[PDB]
Design a protein around this ligand. Sequence first.
Ligand SMILES: O=c1c(O)c(-c2ccc(O)cc2O)oc2cc(O)cc(O)c12
Ligand SMILES: [Zn+2]
Length: 227
Amino acid sequence: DQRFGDLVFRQLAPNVWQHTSYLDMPGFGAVASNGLIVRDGGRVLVVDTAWTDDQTAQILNWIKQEINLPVALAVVTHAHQDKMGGMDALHAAGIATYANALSNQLAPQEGMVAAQHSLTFAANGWVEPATAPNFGPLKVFYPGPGHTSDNITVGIDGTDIAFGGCLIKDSKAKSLGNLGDADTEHYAASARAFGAAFPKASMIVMSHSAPDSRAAITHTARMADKL
Ligand SMILES: O=c1c(O)c(-c2ccc(O)cc2O)oc2cc(O)cc(O)c12
Ligand SMILES: [Zn+2]
């Protein structure tokens, strides 16, 4: 793990890096949010933002420092403070923001900035290619209602890595986390939908825990099975 100011960066794969932003909550401690940075040739693709615009700006600084390549687009998993905190930062940097059509609608409701582009999914939950242009190895998939009704997942094509966001937890998770705007009925199905979408993905990266194995998916499903 390499520390860059207030954020931590860890290389998972040669072209796939993980970022961890920490938010100090008075009386609770430092909360951590993970994200993914993928290098597709001569362009950079970012998955999810940090807690704040400042922290997200640091990520862009790191990308320019190490990779030294421009970010093509940035896609978030859902309209939440732990994932869409640096939307304005990307807009200021001139980066195309991609988000679920529902997320863009929920953004002004959760008190966040909506993305410039909206993603639409089919009946099976797969993203419409028309709304996902020049995504490269970013295969977006909508598992359904889980942590939220707008939560989505992203798979890194060409590799065995998949981003579960905040929908999926680790194999040693004792809690599902925030279940406020979550669905306790379809959660058990959505967790499995993600696993069925990316069965060749062994590296399951989440936003609140280190990259686990496929056991994390089944664990989340089993925990949601009792919801
Ligand atoms: O995923 C969240 C989370 O784990 C948490 C979280 C924080 C503290 C805690 O004890 C448990 C949590 O799930 O923070 C969030 C705050 C948000 O506004 C939206 C979120 O999706 C989260
Ligand atoms: Zn959330």
